[PDB]
Design a protein around this ligand. Structure first.
Ligand SMILES: [Mg+2]
Lengths: 83, 129, 217, 119, 202
């Protein structure tokens, strides 16, 4: 949200679920954030480089977090040349 | 029996979006349904949808962005003049900054903002946001 | 003085975390009220809303305990609610103040129409429900004021909202449920996905990961 | 009945934990040791603690006792439990797999893995 | 000759350990990892997906700057030695046996912990740790059999988490993968650590 002038007005921008697109609220203590490390040509972890995924409590309580994260990681690894 | 195919389509999309599904199925298809979906897609509330031919009313598969809070039908289709749009939006939409009411006017099926722009009235079909 | 027992408390005492928005972003639980006192303590105000006696029947009569309802807020988008039951009124009020501090949440404020100046009302239509009490907030134009009962009006004032329309259904004379429904309605402000939030989220390191080395000792 | 209270049990457990080296299986020597290494307000309590400590030592000699953590027992268990056999108990030379696992491997393309044979 | 690749040898070891043998029932959220059902009724787990999930879990684990923020625990007796060895070699913390309720939520508890990651041998027997972690924004990794519940499981590794050999081999492979990603050991299927150190022993 912005003013007519163009100033940012919101207190903060909440994160969104990587799978459901839902807004992750401040009291959502079932939500998690995961970093998947990247590997070089020799299968060694490159420090500081990873793909970040966030899951809201709703999807994790449903048990669908595993498959959603698997699909998201597969797509992101295909895009990022991590194989 | 089936009375409003548009209601069934919108309710299926709403339930699927709440469940988090990436795709939903609409059966039977209709040109009113297609126009509603095109209005929704114009504003980024849905992805690509595909019509399936079966030598019958048809079928539609809709991609869901995850941006749809709620889409609904209004029944019966009340008469809405150009001056009643403000009241209808106040009744139905969460805010004046976003959200759309779909009307069927003699100029075609369109959202309420376009109806205000063209100064055309008609009948209310539904809403989405 | 204060000896933090949590990573968040250690970071807040070490000045690594300086704004409540940093904690709100990652949805981290807050289990020490000293965190809130350090972060937004100076601007916070408290108010006892109700002292409610409750009684448990026993073999030798009725055991009476008192329920304290406390509301805290900075009047600038932060508000918290605290409920505590204790044998003494003073102990209940202290516990309620602590719990209200521990439960402070961010409140999203938007514009009714034209977006000039600071936000004055709720961004959208929101509804809260506790027990049978349902509280609905509707955006209002500038100058409309807070159209609400005294309990919701106080809760909204502590949240910094300038004008809003409200409607309530159910047993609003159940003060606890009334205030809890108002609090739930206010919390739901930041959970509604609007088109202005359609932008892709760009994640940032969590405080436990950003300051992992410091917390390693 | 004669059921040792929490005080006696805790005192005996802690005393055995801290001074297992000097402990004996004789009640009188144990009570002398307790007099030396602990402050017990009452003689009766000292006697009860000494008796329960003797009972605990008798139990320990047989084997482990829950609630008592002796450094030598844990070290000996770790030493015995960190050993490995000469040959690993995983035979990759011959692997008996049903047909379904064979289709599994064929789908994986691993239809030539050495040691994989149908029943 | 024809030296096998790392994946080939890993899957051969998994087959030797019977990692691909599921139960007679399949959870609807574990079906994507099951290959097919045999005439007896035992579901056969796709070992390629198991290996890929092991690699994914190792990728997640390696990115944790401080290994002491990772907690791996096993409720069942068979996996206790495996989790102990995994913590010993990877450098994380291990909890073998019963899990004290409130360990993740009761900040005044002596055993209070704030792990950045949780590794569990079985979601069914480790239900309480998973439920508690659901209250503290803690990601979860678990070895899931065909009938394991997927609720509050972020990264499920489809494997037989009931046999001692299978559990030991799974934890040994995970430790080797993490160490290789860290760069502290050589790449490939070979690791100086003897796999049977992870097996439950009478
Ligand atoms: Mg018709």
């Amino acid at each position: 949200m912005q003013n007519e002038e163009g100033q940012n007005v919101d207190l903060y921008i909440p994160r969104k679920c990587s799978a459901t697109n839902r807004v992750i609220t401040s009291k959502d203590h079932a939500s998690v954030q995961l970093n998947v490390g990247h590997l070089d040509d020799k299968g060694l972890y490159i420090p500081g480089s990873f793909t970040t995924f966030a899951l809201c409590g709703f999807i994790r309580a449903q048990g669908d977090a595993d498959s959603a994260l698997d699909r998201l990681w597969q797509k992101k690894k295909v895009e990022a040349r991590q194989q | 029996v089936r009375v409003s195919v548009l209601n069934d389509a919108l309710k299926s999309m709403y339930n699927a979006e709440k469940r988090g599904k990436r795709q939903v199925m609409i059966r039977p298809s209709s040109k009113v349904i297609i126009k509603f979906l095109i209005v929704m897609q114009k504003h980024g509330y849905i992805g690509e949808f595909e019509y399936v031919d079966d030598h019958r009313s048809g079928k539609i598969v809709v991609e869901l962005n995850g941006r749809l809070n709620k889409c609904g039908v209004i029944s019966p289709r009340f008469d809405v003049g150009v001056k009643e749009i403000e009241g209808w939006t106040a009744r139905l939409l969460p805010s004046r900054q976003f959200g759309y009411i779909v009307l069927t006017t003699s100029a075609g099926i369109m959202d309420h903002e376009e109806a205000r722009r063209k100064n055309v009235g008609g009948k209310v079909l539904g809403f989405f946001y | 003085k204060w000896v933090p027992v949590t990573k968040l408390g250690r970071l807040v005492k070490d000045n690594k975390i300086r704004s409540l928005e940093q904690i709100y972003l990652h949805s981290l639980p807050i289990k020490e009220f000293q965190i809130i006192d350090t972060l937004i303590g100076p601007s916070l105000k408290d108010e006892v809303m109700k002292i409610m006696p409750v009684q448990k029947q026993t073999r030798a009569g009725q055991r009476t305990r008192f329920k304290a309802f406390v509301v805290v807020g900075d009047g600038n988008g932060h508000v918290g609610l605290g409920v505590k039951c204790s044998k003494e009124v003073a102990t209940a009020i202290r516990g309620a103040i602590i719990l209200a501090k521990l439960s402070v949440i961010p409140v999203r404020r938007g514009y009714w129409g034209n977006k000039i100046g600071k936000p004055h009302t709720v961004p959208c239509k929101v509804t809260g429900k506790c027990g049978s009490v349902t509280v609905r907030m509707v955006p209002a134009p500038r100058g409309a004021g807070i159209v609400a009962a005294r309990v919701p009006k106080k809760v909204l004032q502590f949240a910094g909202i300038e004008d809003v329309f409200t409607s309530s259904r159910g047993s609003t004379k159940t003060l606890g449920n009334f205030v809890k429904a108002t609090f739930d309605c206010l919390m739901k402000t930041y959970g509604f996905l609007t088109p202005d939030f359609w932008k892709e989220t760009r994640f940032t390191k969590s405080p436990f990961q950003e300051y992992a080395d410091i917390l390693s000792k | 009945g004669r059921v040792r209270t929490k005080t006696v049990k805790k005192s005996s457990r802690q005393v055995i934990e801290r001074y297992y080296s000097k402990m004996t299986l004789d009640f009188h020597t144990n009570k002398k040791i307790l007099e030396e290494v602990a402050i017990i307000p009452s003689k009766r309590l000292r006697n009860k603690i000494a008796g329960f400590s003797t009972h605990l030592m008798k139990r320990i000699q047989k084997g482990p006792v829950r609630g008592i953590s002796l450094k030598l027992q844990e070290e000996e268990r770790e030493r015995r439990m960190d050993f490995v056999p000469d040959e690993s108990a995983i035979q990759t030379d011959r692997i008996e797999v049903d047909k379904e696992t064979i289709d599994l491997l064929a789908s994986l393309g691993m239809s030539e893995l050495p040691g994989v044979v149908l029943k | 000759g024809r030296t096998l690749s790392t994946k080939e040898a890993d899957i051969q070891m998994m087959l030797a350990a019977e990692v691909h043998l599921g139960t007679k029932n399949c959870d609807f959220q574990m079906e994507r990892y099951v290959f097919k059902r045999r005439n007896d009724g035992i579901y056969i787990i796709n070992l390629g997906k198991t290996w890929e999930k092991l690699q994914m879990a190792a990728r997640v684990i390696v990115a944790i700057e401080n290994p002491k923020d990772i907690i791996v625990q096993s409720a069942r007796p068979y996996g206790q030695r495996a989790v102990l060895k995994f913590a010993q070699y990877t450098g994380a913390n291990a909890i073998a046996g019963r899990h004290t309720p409130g360990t993740f939520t009761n900040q005044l508890q002596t055993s209070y912990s704030e792990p950045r990651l949780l590794i569990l041998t079985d979601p069914r027997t480790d239900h309480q740790p998973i439920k508690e972690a659901a209250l503290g924004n803690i990601p979860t990794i678990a070895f899931c059999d065909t009938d394991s519940p997927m609720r509050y499981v972020d990264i499920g590794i489809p494997a037989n988490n009931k046999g001692k050999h299978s559990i030991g081999v799974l934890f040994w492979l995970l430790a080797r993968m993490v160490l290789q990603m860290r760069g502290s050991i050589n790449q490939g299927h070979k690791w100086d650590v003897m796999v049977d150190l992870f097996f439950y022993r009478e």
